[PDB]
Every structure is written in C-alpha cells, then in structure tokens.
C-alpha cells in the first residue's frame, strides 16, 4: 500500500537497475525524470541530499513528485534500493532463498562494483587503456555459471545491478561515444565479439530478453542520444595515448 | 552445521568486518592467517582466485585450512560475506526485520563504500588531500541516528562493515602511519577531535565497546605494528599538495 516513487533519468544505468527490479517485483510505482546533470530542481536535495539519481521515496501521503513530502522515507543508493525491493516483495523471489546462492548474487554485485564499474568509468570518462577493463570483464564473465543461467542461477537482483552497464557498452561503442580512441574502440568491439566473450554476450542477450529490460529501455539509438547529453561523456571528444 | 573457515590477516579491515559479524552471530568458525601481501601460499587461489583477504570456505569435509577441499563453497568479497552470515544466522538478528530499517543499513554500507572507503585508501596509500575524506566522513556521520545508536538503530552488519576502518583511523593518525603530509595529519587529528565529529566519535566508542570488537582487535599498538608490515605503507614517504 505504501507508495514508491523513483526519481530517474534515461541515460543513468544506476536508475535503470532499480527500474528493472521494480518491474521484476510487480510493484506499483511512479517514475519521475530529473535533469540531474544539467538543471537540477531546487527541491531535489529534499529527496536526495547527495544530489544523485536515482532517488526513492517510500510511503507518506500521495503527493506530486516535484512536491515531495517530509513524511516519506528517503532511500539513497541503487544497490540499497535493489535489496529494499527484494525485501518488500518476498513472493517475487528477487533473491534466492538458499544462503549460498544468495551469496553468489551478493558476490557478483560486489565484483562488478569493486573491479568492473571503475574500469568502465576510467575508459569512458578518461580514455584510459581498455585492456584492464577487458580483463575485469573476463573476470566477471568467469563468475557466471559457464553452461548458462543468470549470476546466481535463477534471475536475481544481481542481474538488475549489472545489465544496465553491459547493455550500454555495445551501442555506446558502436556510436564511438566515450573518451577512448578509435583504436581502443575497435579493440573493444572486436574483443566483445570474439569467442573470448561468448559467455557474457549470452548473458546480455538473456537479460535483455526479459520484459523487465524491454519495458525500461528506450531503444539502443534513443539510449545513445540520451547518453550524448551527459557532460562527462564529452560527445565529440577523444583522448589518444 | 556446515563448517565456516575465514582466511584472515590482522592488518586487514576487510577481514575484520567478517570476524565482527561472526562474533555477533555466535557462529562456530575457524580463522587462518595468510601472509597475503608478502608470501601468498601456493594453495590460496583455491580459496579465492582473486588472491585477496578475506576468503571464506563453507561446508565440505572438515580439512586443515591449508588443505582446502574442492567441495566447500568459496565465498568472496567481505560485504557478500556479511550478508551471508546474516542469512545463515537469522536468529541472531544481524539485520533488522523492517524493510525501511534494513534499507538504512544497506544505504549506510553503500555510502561508506562509494564515498568514504576510496578516500581512506587514497589519503593513506597515495597521500591525496585530506579535506575530501573529512567531507565524506561528515556525510557518513550525518546518516547516523542523531541521538545515539547504530547505523540502522539496533546494531547490524552495517556497523561491522564500517567500524574496522573508523577504529583504525584514530591510532593510525596518532602513530603517523600513512603517506599524507604532516600538515594533513595535523588537520585530520584536529578535525577528528573537534565538535564537528562528536557524533562519529560516539559511534566508534559504541561499536568498540561491544565484545565483537574487543575479541577481534589485537589492541591499538598491535594493530599499528601489523599495519607497518603493509608494503604500500612505505615508511619515510610522504606526498604533498
Ligand atoms: Ca541526518
């Protein structure tokens, strides 16, 4: 019965995580776009003082999202939101019930956060060399069950945490968006198409085929256009060597 | 009933997290020290292919920790291990049961991970400026309940996640451990003693007063000596900005 409002932005993989989870949960919820990188509304720090998307309000009186209530719980940090949605909707089985399988999900989310995400950021925002990112992606790929399935076997929030980033990689590379050079772009495109990365390609197809992805993705071309609005992606700019 | 083995090192705040949680759970468990920074045993990648401490094995036959079994589950990443211990020992109430309070715990862990931990690492190991670390610590302090108590009210794994780092800060500063400049050491010592940080000092005292801390801490001087064994804490080197 308690309302959920998610403050979102199409470009944001962090917001995308939470939309996927809410879809998989069958939740009733509102989304409200915020132009966080270019024109943040003066009320936005009332929902998230960190001034980041996503933000979430929970409960309180039903109010317009641009008039947030002080009575709603304010929840920050996308991974905390994923665990919250799992806790709110236990019948949706957004995590396994077995402790070891649950730990596979948590480990996969930590491997992504601690080893992969920062490599994506370095390559895309600074144009650092692509090899350490490919190495990190090969490590993450090796944590998947080789013969098929999601991170913990059955789909879980671990897959919501990771697919937004992997799904953006392919179309962003095809558009040449990000500070890496053409040489490294070609290298990453060839690597991600090679047998070395067949398993992570299967993973991306499997996550993308679910309605939770279809219903929260604008389309590859539209997602690229939204990403070009991100100041830190510096459309038209590339660093070399 | 299944065995728990935690591969540990006294200097490591990451391993310390998990020891605290195991104590709070009342678990039966084995610890085994690993000289991971100077002399990693050849068998260690069998328990953690990432070659990091902590490592955990769960179940399988009872074997000496230096003879790990292929049959035990290998669990990596300290925050995944914290959630695993909470899942294995529900009667110990290592997380709240209320979803919003659980989300406070997960948010606190994410705030620490995403904003504070990298600042501690960069100030101590690279000598980067201390002001962003102090700003991150003030933000984390602001997430605590103002009147006392732990991150989510009652003690939870969020406090296990954070106290190893905060508890090391004070004696490390007094011993002059770290690559930051003298000026920044003075700044940090004065700040951490100032009224600005009264709330986090109370938090550290409250977490340290619990048996789970006392029984997993070697003593301030002993912890300082263990930290001096860390190669990246190069004695006699300082960076200046
Ligand atoms: Ca506050």
Author numbering:
A (entry chain A), B (entry chain B): 4 to 244
Paste lines from the article.
To further explore this issue, we have conducted biochemical and crystallographic studies on the interactions of six GSTOs from T. versicolor with chemical libraries. The six TvGSTOs (named TvGSTO1S to TvGSTO6S) used in this study are representatives of the twelve TvGSTOs that have a catalytic serine, while four others have a cysteine instead. In this study, we demonstrated at the biochemical and structural level that T. versicolor GSTs that belong to the Omega class interact with polyphenolic compounds found in wood, and in particular with flavonoids such as dihydrowogonin and naringenin. The ability of TvGSTOs to bind polyphenols through different sites suggests that fungal GSTs could be involved in the transport of various polyphenols.
